[PDB]
User: Which sequence fits this backbone?
RNA sequence: GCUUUACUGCAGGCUGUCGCUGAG
RNA sequence: AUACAGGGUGACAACCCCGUACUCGAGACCAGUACGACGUGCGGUAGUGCCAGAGUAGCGGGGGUUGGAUAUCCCUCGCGA
RNA sequence: GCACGGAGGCGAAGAACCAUGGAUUUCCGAAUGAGAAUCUCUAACAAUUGCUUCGCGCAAUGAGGAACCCCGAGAACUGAAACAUCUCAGUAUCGGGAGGAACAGAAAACGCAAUGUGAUGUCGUUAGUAACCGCGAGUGAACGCGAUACAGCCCAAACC
C-alpha cells in the first residue's frame, strides 16, 4: 500500500481541537493536552526560549 | 553562670557520645518511619534554634526534613559527549543537602518563609535538618521588631533565591576578601565561575 | 432624552422598578416589531430604551435601590 | 459526526462571519471580505 | 441578568404553527430551559402555556415552539405586537 | 527516660508537689529549666523538680549529673503541667527548683531523704 | 552507521575498605 | 520678533491657522525621603577566667569550578577542636 | 468610532470630546465544588499551609509580565588548521523564583608591611599585569588608585 495518497484516505480521526484555554486548535482531545499553551499539563503557559532567536 | 542552653549545645558537640548518643539511636527509628517533611512542636536543638532566630511565638514554625545522602542522582548521557562530560557517578550537585532540605520544607509550607536551619544528625542514608519557618502574615510577627524584616515583600521565597543562611554560605559568600572575586555580589553576575 | 437623570432620582425605589419594567416592555415590543420586518421604526428610540434602562439600573445601585 | 452545544455555537458564528460586506458600507467608506471561507476549499478549526 | 425571551420568531413556518396549531415561536436565550420559557411567556402575554419544544439553532440562539391552551388564541396574542 | 535512673512512686510525688506549693507561698521557688540550672550552679537550690514527659529530652538531660556534683537533691515528676501548676504557673514546666523552702523545710528535707533512699 | 585483542574514556558486574554499626 | 523650532493652508508663508518665545497652572516621581519634633539614653575608671553562634574551625578520600598556581570557590564520603 | 450610505436620533436640561473617580463587567482561563475542547452536574478558598472561637471563622500561596535580577541543571557544532586535557562556555537550552529594580553590605577584611586603608555595588584604571595551560591554542583576576553614591544597625547569651 502506498504511504502516499492511498494511506491518506483513512484519516478521519479527530485529535487536535479548539483549546478551552488559549483558543488555538491544538487541544489534543485524546491526550487532553494542548500542544500550544500546555493546557491539561501545566498550570503555567507553555513557553520556550527557543521560540525566538537566542539574543531576542 | 552557664545557661541551661549551654548544656544542649555542649551535648551536640559530640552527638555520638553519651546520652544524646542514645537518644539518636532511639529517635532515628521513629524518624525513619516519618515523612520527608514533618512539622514539630519543639526544636530538638533549642539553643541552636534560638541562636538562629527562633522564638516560642505565634507564627513561628519548625520542621524536620529527611533527604538522601551521597552525590547526585544523575542520568547518563543519551547522546554525543566528550570523555570529560561522560561523567555520572562522580558528579555531585553544587547545592548542599542542608539547602535542599530548607527548600523541601519551604514548599511544604507555601505561605511560610525560611528563617534558618540546622542539622539534627544522619544515619547511613538520610540526613536530617530541622528548618525554622516564619508566617510573614501573622501579626505578632508583623509586630515583632526582630523578625518583621522577613515580612517585607522583597523577601518572598528567600530560599529559592539563596538568601537563606546556608544559601549564602554555599554561595561562596563567607569571606569578604581574597577568594570571593567571582562570588560577590552574585554568582550569576560573575559569569557563574564560583 | 425623554427621560432625564434628575427625574429618575426623583422617583421612589418602586417607581424606578415600575418604570424599568415599562421600558423593558417597550423595548421588547420594539424588537418584536423589528423581528417582523416592521418599518414603523424610529431607530433613535430602540437605542434610547437601552440607555434609559442602563440609567435606571445605575441610579438604583447608587441609591441603594 | 456528533457536535456539542459549544461546537454548534462556533460553527454558527463562522457561518455568520461568512457573509459579505454590506453594500451600504461601500458607499459610506467611498470604497472585500478577506475571511470568506468556502466549506469545500477551506477548513475550519476543531 | 439575562432575560429569557428575546423576541418573537416570525417566519412563514411560524405563521402556520400560529394559524393552524395555536403556537407561538420565540428567539430565547440558550440557557433557558423549557420551564423558564413557559413561565416567562405566561407572565408576559398573560396566557396558559401547554407545551414548549426547543431547538438550539445554527444561528447561535435557541428557538422555542410554545403551544397555548385552546383557551387562548395565538393569532391574537401575536397581533398586538 | 534516658536521664531518669529511678522511679518515683505516685505518693512520694504527691508529697513532693504539695511541698512545692507551700514553698512558692511560704518560701522561694525557681520556675523554668534555665533559672533552675542557675540555682544548682549557684548552690542556692535545695530541691529541684524534673518532669519525665519532656521532649526533646535535651532540655533536661543535664539536671541529674549536674545536681549530683553539686550535692543538690532532685526528684522526678511524671507530668510536665503538674509541676507547672504546682509551681504556680498557668503553663507547664520542664523543671522547677525550690530555692529555700518555706513552712516545709521539714517535709521537704525528708523527701530528699526518701529519694536518696530510693537510690 | 557498523566492528574489533585501535586510542581514550563511560555505565554495569565482581572484589577489598569506610560509614550506617551494637554486645560477649 | 524674549516668538526667523516644526506643521497646516489649492505652489517657496515669522506676520492666513496650529503652534513657537515669554509668563503661569496642574498631575506624577523624588519621598512617607530631607528638615523639624517626641521618647530612649551615650560615654569613662577599677575589679571580676560571668557571657559571646560545632559536625563548625581544622584534617583526610573523590570530584567539580577558578587566573587561583601548594596559594580560587563549592559538592560529597570519613574524621574532628 | 475607524467609516464620507440610507433612515432616524442626540445636543443650551450644555451633548461631542478630555481628565479623575464610580457603576456594570457573560463564559473559559492560576481557575479553586465536580466533571468538560469555552459547556454541564448537585453548596464549595480545590490543593498545600499559618493562626485558630478547631467553623474555611480570619489569612497566605498558585498565574502573568519587554527585558533586566537571583538560585539551580547544563550541551554540541566550532578553535587547537586532526584530536582526547584545553576551547566554544558556565555560552545555547532546561527547572525554581523576587522586585521596580534585583543581588551585595558594615571585616575572624586589606597586607602600596604600614605611625597605613576602613561596609557594598557600579564606572575608569590597575592589565592583557599576576596566575593557569597537550606551558600548545588559548584563558585571565585582585589589592590599590581616580570617581559615583554614601549609613549604619538588630539578635543569641550572660544579668533580670
Ligand atoms: Cl523562603
Ligand atoms: Cl591599603
Ligand atoms: K569538544
Ligand atoms: Mg513514511
Ligand atoms: Mg549587579
Ligand atoms: Mg445563510
Ligand atoms: Mg431536543
Ligand atoms: Mg573549565
Ligand atoms: Mg471548575
Ligand atoms: Mg580542531
Ligand atoms: Mg598542536
Ligand atoms: Mg575561562
Ligand atoms: Mg587583594
Ligand atoms: Na514558602
Ligand atoms: Na570556581
Ligand atoms: Na472543509
Ligand atoms: Na435575534
Ligand atoms: Na552511516
Ligand atoms: Na573534602
Ligand atoms: Na470595565
Ligand atoms: Na486563598
Ligand atoms: Na478553617
Ligand atoms: Na582545523
Ligand atoms: Na575530523
Ligand atoms: Na591544557
Ligand atoms: Na598610592
Assistant:
Amino acid at each position: 500500500t502506498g504511504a502516499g495518497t492511498p494511506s491518506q484516505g483513512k484519516k478521519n480521526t479527530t485529535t487536535h481541537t479548539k483549546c478551552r484555554r488559549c483558543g488555538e486548535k491544538s487541544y489534543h482531545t485524546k491526550k487532553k493536552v494542548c500542544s500550544s499553551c500546555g493546557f491539561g499539563k501545566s498550570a503555567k503557559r507553555r513557553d520556550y526560549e527557543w521560540q525566538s532567536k537566542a539574543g531576542e | 553562670a552557664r545557661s541551661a542552653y549551654s548544656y544542649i549545645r555542649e551535648a551536640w558537640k559530640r552527638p555520638k557520645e553519651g546520652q544524646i548518643a542514645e537518644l539518636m539511636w532511639h529517635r532515628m527509628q521513629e524518624w525513619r518511619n516519618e515523612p520527608a517533611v514533618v512539622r514539630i512542636e519543639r526544636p530538638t536543638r533549642l539553643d541552636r534554634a534560638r541562636s538562629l532566630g527562633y522564638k516560642a511565638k505565634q507564627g513561628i514554625i519548625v520542621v524536620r526534613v529527611a533527604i538522601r545522602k551521597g552525590s547526585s542522582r544523575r542520568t547518563r548521557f543519551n547522546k554525543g559527549r566528550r570523555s570529560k562530560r561522560m561523567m555520572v557517578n562522580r558528579i555531585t550537585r553544587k547545592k548542599n543537602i542542608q539547602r535542599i532540605a530548607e527548600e523541601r520544607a519551604n514548599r511544604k509550607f507555601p505561605n511560610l518563609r525560611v528563617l534558618n536551619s540546622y542539622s539534627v544528625g544522619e544515619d547511613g542514608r538520610h540526613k536530617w535538618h530541622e528548618v525554622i519557618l516564619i508566617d510573614p502574615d501573622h501579626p505578632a510577627i508583623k509586630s515583632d521588631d526582630q523578625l518583621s524584616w522577613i515580612s517585607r515583600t522583597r523577601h518572598r521565597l528567600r530560599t529559592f533565591r539563596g538568601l537563606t543562611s546556608a544559601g549564602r554560605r554555599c554561595r561562596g559568600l563567607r569571606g569578604q576578601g581574597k577568594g570571593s572575586e567571582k562570588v560577590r555580589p552574585s554568582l550569576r553576575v560573575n559569569g557563574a565561575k564560583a | 432624552t425623554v427621560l432625564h437623570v434628575q427625574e429618575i432620582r426623583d422617583m421612589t425605589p418602586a417607581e424606578r422598578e415600575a418604570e424599568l419594567d415599562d421600558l423593558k416592555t417597550e423595548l421588547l415590543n420594539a424588537r418584536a416589531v423589528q423581528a417582523a420586518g416592521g418599518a414603523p421604526e424610529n431607530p433613535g428610540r430602540i437605542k434610547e430604551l437601552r440607555k434609559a434602562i442602563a440609567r435606571i439600573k445605575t441610579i438604583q445601585g447608587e441609591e441603594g435601590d | 459526526g456528533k457536535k456539542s452545544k459549544a461546537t454548534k455555537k462556533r460553527l454558527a458564528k463562522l457561518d455568520n462571519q461568512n457573509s459579505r460586506v454590506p453594500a451600504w458600507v461601500m458607499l459610506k467608506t467611498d470604497e472585500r471580505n478577506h475571511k470568506r471561507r468556502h466549506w469545500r476549499r477551506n477548513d475550519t478549526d476543531e | 441578568s439575562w432575560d429569557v425571551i428575546k423576541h418573537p420568531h416570525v417566519t412563514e413556518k411560524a405563521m402556520n404553527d400560529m394559524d393552524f396549531q395555536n403556537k407561538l415561536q420565540f428567539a430565547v436565550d440558550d440557557r433557558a430551559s423549557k420551564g423558564e420559557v413557559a413561565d416567562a411567556v405566561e407572565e408576559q402575554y398573560d396566557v396558559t402555556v401547554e407545551q414548549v419544544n426547543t431547538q438550539n439553532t445554527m444561528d447561535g440562539e435557541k428557538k422555542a415552539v410554545v403551544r397555548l391552551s385552546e383557551d387562548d388564541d395565538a393569532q391574537e396574542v401575536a397581533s398586538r405586537i | 527516660p534516658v536521664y531518669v535512673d529511678f522511679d518515683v512512686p505516685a505518693d512520694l510525688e504527691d508529697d513532693a508537689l504539695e511541698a512545692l506549693e507551700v514553698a512558692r507561698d511560704t518560701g522561694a521557688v525557681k520556675k523554668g529549666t534555665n533559672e533552675t540550672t542557675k540555682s544548682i550552679e549557684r548552690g542556692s537550690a535545695e530541691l529541684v523538680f524534673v518532669a519525665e514527659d519532656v521532649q526533646p529530652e535535651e532540655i533536661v538531660m543535664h539536671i541529674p549529673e549536674l545536681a549530683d556534683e553539686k550535692g543538690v537533691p532532685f526528684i522526678f515528676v511524671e507530668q510536665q503541667d503538674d509541676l507547672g501548676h504546682a509551681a504556680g504557673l498557668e503553663v507547664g514546666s520542664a523543671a522547677a527548683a525550690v530555692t529555700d523552702a518555706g513552712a516545709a523545710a521539714t517535709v521537704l528535707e525528708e523527701i530528699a531523704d526518701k529519694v536518696e533512699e530510693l537510690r
Observations:
- Residues 1-81 of chain E form a domain with the Alpha-Beta Plaits fold (CATH 3.30.70.330).
